[PDB]
Write a protein that binds this ligand. Structure first.
Ligand SMILES: *[C@@H]1O[C@H](CO)[C@@H](O[C@@H]2O[C@H](CO)[C@@H](O[C@@H]3O[C@H](CO[C@H]4O[C@H](CO[C@H]5O[C@H](CO)[C@@H](O)[C@H](O)[C@@H]5O)[C@@H](O)[C@H](O[C@H]5O[C@H](CO)[C@@H](O)[C@H](O)[C@@H]5O)[C@@H]4O)[C@@H](O)[C@H](O[C@H]4O[C@H](CO)[C@@H](O)[C@H](O)[C@@H]4O)[C@@H]3O)[C@H](O)[C@H]2NC(C)=O)[C@H](O)[C@H]1NC(C)=O
Ligand SMILES: *[C@@H]1O[C@H](CO)[C@@H](O[C@@H]2O[C@H](CO)[C@@H](O[C@@H]3O[C@H](CO[C@H]4O[C@H](CO[C@H]5O[C@H](CO)[C@@H](O)[C@H](O)[C@@H]5O)[C@@H](O)[C@H](O[C@H]5O[C@H](CO)[C@@H](O)[C@H](O)[C@@H]5O)[C@@H]4O)[C@@H](O)[C@H](O[C@H]4O[C@H](CO)[C@@H](O)[C@H](O)[C@@H]4O)[C@@H]3O)[C@H](O)[C@H]2NC(C)=O)[C@H](O)[C@H]1NC(C)=O
Ligand SMILES: *[C@@H]1O[C@H](CO)[C@@H](O[C@@H]2O[C@H](CO)[C@@H](O[C@@H]3O[C@H](CO[C@H]4O[C@H](CO[C@H]5O[C@H](CO)[C@@H](O)[C@H](O)[C@@H]5O)[C@@H](O)[C@H](O[C@H]5O[C@H](CO)[C@@H](O)[C@H](O)[C@@H]5O)[C@@H]4O)[C@@H](O)[C@H](O[C@H]4O[C@H](CO)[C@@H](O)[C@H](O)[C@@H]4O)[C@@H]3O)[C@H](O)[C@H]2NC(C)=O)[C@H](O)[C@H]1NC(C)=O
Ligand SMILES: *[C@@H]1O[C@H](CO[C@@H]2O[C@@H](C)[C@@H](O)[C@@H](O)[C@@H]2O)[C@@H](O[C@@H]2O[C@H](CO)[C@@H](O[C@@H]3O[C@H](CO[C@H]4O[C@H](CO[C@H]5O[C@H](CO)[C@@H](O)[C@H](O)[C@@H]5O)[C@@H](O)[C@H](O)[C@@H]4O)[C@@H](O)[C@H](O[C@H]4O[C@H](CO)[C@@H](O)[C@H](O)[C@@H]4O)[C@@H]3O)[C@H](O)[C@H]2NC(C)=O)[C@H](O)[C@H]1NC(C)=O
Ligand SMILES: *[C@@H]1O[C@H](CO)[C@@H](O[C@@H]2O[C@H](CO)[C@@H](O)[C@H](O)[C@H]2NC(C)=O)[C@H](O)[C@H]1NC(C)=O
Ligand SMILES: *[C@@H]1O[C@H](CO)[C@@H](O[C@@H]2O[C@H](CO)[C@@H](O)[C@H](O)[C@H]2NC(C)=O)[C@H](O)[C@H]1NC(C)=O
Ligand SMILES: *[C@@H]1O[C@H](CO)[C@@H](O)[C@H](O)[C@H]1NC(C)=O
Ligand SMILES: *[C@@H]1O[C@H](CO)[C@@H](O)[C@H](O)[C@H]1NC(C)=O
Ligand SMILES: *[C@@H]1O[C@H](CO)[C@@H](O)[C@H](O)[C@H]1NC(C)=O
Ligand SMILES: *[C@@H]1O[C@H](CO)[C@@H](O)[C@H](O)[C@H]1NC(C)=O
Ligand SMILES: *[C@@H]1O[C@H](CO)[C@@H](O)[C@H](O)[C@H]1NC(C)=O
Ligand SMILES: *[C@@H]1O[C@H](CO)[C@@H](O)[C@H](O)[C@H]1NC(C)=O
Ligand SMILES: *[C@@H]1O[C@H](CO)[C@@H](O)[C@H](O)[C@H]1NC(C)=O
Lengths: 136, 106, 119, 136, 136
């Protein structure tokens, strides 16, 4: 067992790739684009390409963070939910996913139901808060 | 107004023995106690504070412990530098009273 | 860093007033409090008062409540102690002690050489 | 009961409007402003307006997320607090609020105390963390 | 005891400065830069300088928020972790830190191990989620 770099476990199965989640998560907002950049210096050809790279790097981070908040998974690497798995998105067993598939292969298999799953996840978290307000 | 009483008055001692100094209290003091080593012609030198912690530069052979009302100061390997008298002070009441003091014979 | 130095010895006649100054240097004066103790000859130290050189707040001992007052000076970083109505039993070595830390010291870090006064 | 669109339950009372919170929350950062935009193309009259629109959308989203973090409500749709209600902000009973008022009318009624309430919520969350550090 | 302003407790020890955390935390994203700004008005000399400030104010907020999320401390002022203190970063006792040091002095003392400490905290939170998936 050795530590990998960024996306070094893209080719490995899920069971082994999930042990390197902090490697990818740690590089989502921080980069050399936020440096000091060594005829307005910020209106030059690359004064603009850097500015739009900084805004791009932020929306990419907030896009993922928006969903984590709705689903109640803020501040977690691996978050468990209360949504049962529906055997129409995929009916593969444990060994056929975590020992035989890569994260890229799988996310393409369920690519048709991600939007449906996202809405279900958001609605499920809403019911937990509704069921808690009228319970305490 | 807590009075500190510590015994024994004197400790016949030589090199290499477990010398123990006990400082009692008239009321609950807690861990807020300090030990001072006074050599002749010199101001008192703090050695142990909080009844457990050791001041900077003191040899590790020193040690202290206890809480509530009973406290001790033990030197495992008494050496010819641990002469002079010792005092215990309380650091929680409006006056921070000292103790009568004990002298070690070496 | 830090070192407290007091004045020289004084031989004051009974009934007079004695002022002893403890000069602090080479460290932030206002950060650490100052305490005064007197070691009666052939006896153990006695605690008298604690003065904060930051806001001037002082704490005294009841027997010395009406006789003793402590004042602090900031610009030259000196601590003063005056005692009036000097009884014959007041003869003792007087020490100025710096607090261990900046808050809830529970210990004295640095002392002065002492000032033995005869009355 | 039918699903509503964006702000479709603006005119209904709170008791019925609070069942559609995820409709408004799901549209706060994501929009068509982040498209590819079909003489520096990013400096044109409508290249600048798109850029500052992208930055406007982010600040509006982070302006709400800043408070949720302070109050300890990250990742929650409905978040319960430990701050008792003060009968000076409003003294209406249960039926006079959740069955007789819309969210617009109410937020206007307590508009004078929103800033005061925000400060209290942050202070309350701070005390819980203080009371936890010196308890474990 | 009196309330302080922004950075008013920078000179006080930690034991006293830790009671004014919400004063600094409340001012990290909100400022007058987001006003209406009273020859394209957004390309002038100070139209650009304002836009860059708005993006800078957002990166600074998200830079700290990224670390809070990885460590499981989202939505908390003071967050407790499960990482034991290593007596090589600093071996000072309780009174030598919280009664004798300021936050500036301390953060300079462990400045050599902040990067190492950050990585450990992320790795610790990752283990908690791993240990929870294969426990429920
Ligand atoms: C690129 O792709 C390739 C192929 O897809 C991929 O290679 C796989 O890598 C994974 C690593 O994650 C391998 O899985 C590991 O295999 C280890 C070796 O397993 C074999 O040997 C076992 C006994 O070895 C012991 O004894 C020998 C001396 O005899 C000694 O040298 C060894 O060091 C070791 O001490 C044997 O038990 C094992 O049998 C397993 O597998 C067979 C067939 O799969 C199965 O039928 C058995 O029931 C049993 O499960 C096999 O013969 C193995 O040690 C290691 O186990 C550790 O990790 C698991 C994780 O769960 C723990 O549970 C376990 O307790 C150990 O800690 C792990 O299983 C896998 O074998 C490779 N596949 C192939 C075909 O080689 C690369 O990783 C990919 N790379 C990238 C970058 O993507
Ligand atoms: C725009 O504004 C308008 C007006 O402000 C607003 O209209 C209100 O809409 C809400 C919907 O959220 C209405 O509330 C619902 O009312 C339903 C009907 O209630 C009446 O009928 C009940 C009996 O009906 C049963 O039997 C008949 C056959 O007889 C059958 O056809 C029905 O389908 C049903 O099976 C009756 O019991 C009820 O009595 C209640 O109300 C009176 C007076 O308010 C009160 O005195 C009683 O004590 C009792 O509370 C009433 O006469 C009702 O079914 C429905 O109940 C469901 O939801 C509640 C939510 O808590 C559940 O608790 C309950 O178990 C049911 O699941 C709900 O109460 C409200 O009546 C409308 N107001 C008016 C004036 O019409 C629009 O919604 C607004 N629109 C927008 C977009 O903003
Ligand atoms: C800038 O720097 C300076 C210096 O670094 C710094 O000044 C320090 O400020 C802190 C404030 O946080 C001070 O700490 C407080 O001290 C208070 C006063 O303590 C003295 O007096 C106590 C008795 O006073 C009571 O009785 C008198 C009448 O006699 C009355 O007027 C008083 O109001 C009060 O009711 C006395 O017990 C106390 O003894 C403590 O300290 C000594 C030595 O430090 C120690 O040996 C003892 O064991 C004991 O711990 C001292 O003599 C004190 O009241 C206050 O206590 C409250 O807060 C603590 C917090 O834990 C609670 O536990 C406690 O229950 C009380 O609620 C607190 O301890 C500190 O003394 C200052 N230091 C100096 C040298 O003056 C500034 O704050 C800095 N400013 C900025 C902006 O950075
Ligand atoms: C609470 O904090 C205070 C203050 O901390 C200090 O200030 C803050 C703002 C930060 O900058 C801190 O980093 C900084 O430390 C603590 O007070 C300090 O306490 C230490 C230990 O008691 C004390 O150091 C001892 O001084 C003794 C007397 O001073 C003589 O020596 C000095 C030496 O100075 C030379 O060296 C320094 C560093 O190398 C140089 O910077 C300097 O320029 C000099 O070249 C000398 O200047 C004096 O004139 C005296 O001659 C001294 O006897 C000790 O030496 C012994 O040290 C160890 C024991 O620790 C032995 O093993 C050795 O063999 C030596 O015999 C120490 O040097 C500081 O001076 C204090 N500073 C102040 C400002 O008061 C306090 O301790 C803290 N309390 C706690 C932690 O409970
Ligand atoms: C996911 O959805 C796509 C789109 O509906 C499916 O792709 C279709 O597959 C059928 C099966 O023969 C073809 O006739 C269609 O032409 C395909 N559509 C397109 C746009 O290519 C796909 O099968 C679904 N399943 C998966 C796993 O992707
Ligand atoms: C933190 O790391 C720095 C860098 O290694 C240390 O600074 C060095 O200290 C040694 C000690 O004499 C010097 O010889 C080096 O020249 C210093 N390096 C630099 C770049 O100045 C520092 O001592 C470490 N510890 C702390 C508390 O900062
Ligand atoms: C699973 O999803 C399909 C749509 O993809 C839906 O029709 C079906 O009802 C779902 N299963 C369950 C048990 O809800
Ligand atoms: C799983 O789903 C596939 C649909 O692609 C189907 O062909 C297969 O028979 C299913 N297997 C089981 C065990 O239901
Ligand atoms: C309620 O708020 C008012 C000011 O809005 C305040 O004066 C009052 O003390 C508050 N009530 C309580 C119980 O604190
Ligand atoms: C509620 O507050 C209003 C003030 O707007 C007052 O007129 C009314 O009497 C109050 N009612 C009760 C029950 O306290
Ligand atoms: C709020 O404050 C304004 C200005 O002080 C006052 O006129 C008004 O009556 C208050 N109450 C409401 C509900 O606006
Ligand atoms: C403490 O940190 C050092 C490196 O800074 C490391 O070598 C050591 O192993 C750590 N302590 C423990 C107990 O792991
Ligand atoms: C703490 O670490 C320092 C290293 O700077 C060392 O000099 C000192 O002796 C250590 N103290 C203890 C009690 O381990």
């Amino acid at each position: 067992a050795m530590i990998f770099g960024f996306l070094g476990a893209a080719g490995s199965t899920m069971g082994a790739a999930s042990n390197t989640l902090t490697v990818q998560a740690r590089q989502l907002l921080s980069g050399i684009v936020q440096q000091q950049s060594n005829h307005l210096l910020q209106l030059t050809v690359w004064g603009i390409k850097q500015l739009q790279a900084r805004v791009l790097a932020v929306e990419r981070y907030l896009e993922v963070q928006k969903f984590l908040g709705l689903w109640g998974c803020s501040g977690k690497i691996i978050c468990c939910t209360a949504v049962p798995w529906n055997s129409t998105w995929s009916n593969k067993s444990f060994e056929q996913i975590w020992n035989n598939m890569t994260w890229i292969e799988w996310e393409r298999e369920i690519s048709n139901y991600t939007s449906q799953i996202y809405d279900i996840l958001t609605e499920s978290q809403f019911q937990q808060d509704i069921n808690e307000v009228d319970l305490l | 107004a807590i009075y500190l009483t510590q015994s024994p008055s004197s400790l016949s001692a030589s090199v290499g023995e477990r010398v123990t100094i006990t400082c009692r209290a008239s009321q609950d003091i807690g861990d807020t106690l300090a030990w001072y080593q006074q050599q002749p012609g010199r101001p008192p030198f703090l050695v142990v504070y909080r009844a457990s912690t050791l001041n900077y530069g003191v040899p590790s052979r020193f040690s202290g412990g206890g809480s509530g009302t009973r406290f001790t100061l033990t030197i495992s390997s008494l050496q010819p530098a641990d002469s002079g008298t010792y005092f215990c002070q309380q650091f929680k009441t409006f006056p921070f009273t000292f103790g009568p003091g004990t002298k070690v014979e070496v | 860093q830090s070192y407290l130095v007091q004045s020289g010895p004084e031989v004051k006649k009974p009934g007079t007033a004695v002022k002893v100054s403890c000069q602090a240097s080479r460290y932030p004066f206002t950060f650490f409090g100052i305490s005064w103790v007197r070691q009666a000859p052939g006896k153990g130290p006695q605690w008298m008062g604690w003065i904060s050189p930051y806001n001037g707040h002082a704490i005294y001992l009841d027997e010395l409540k009406d006789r003793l007052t402590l004042t602090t000076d900031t610009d030259t970083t000196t601590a003063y102690m005056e005692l009036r109505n000097l009884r014959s039993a007041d003869t003792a070595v007087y020490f100025c002690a710096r607090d261990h830390t900046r808050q809830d010291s529970r210990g004295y870090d640095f002392w002065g050489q002492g000032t033995l006064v005869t009355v």
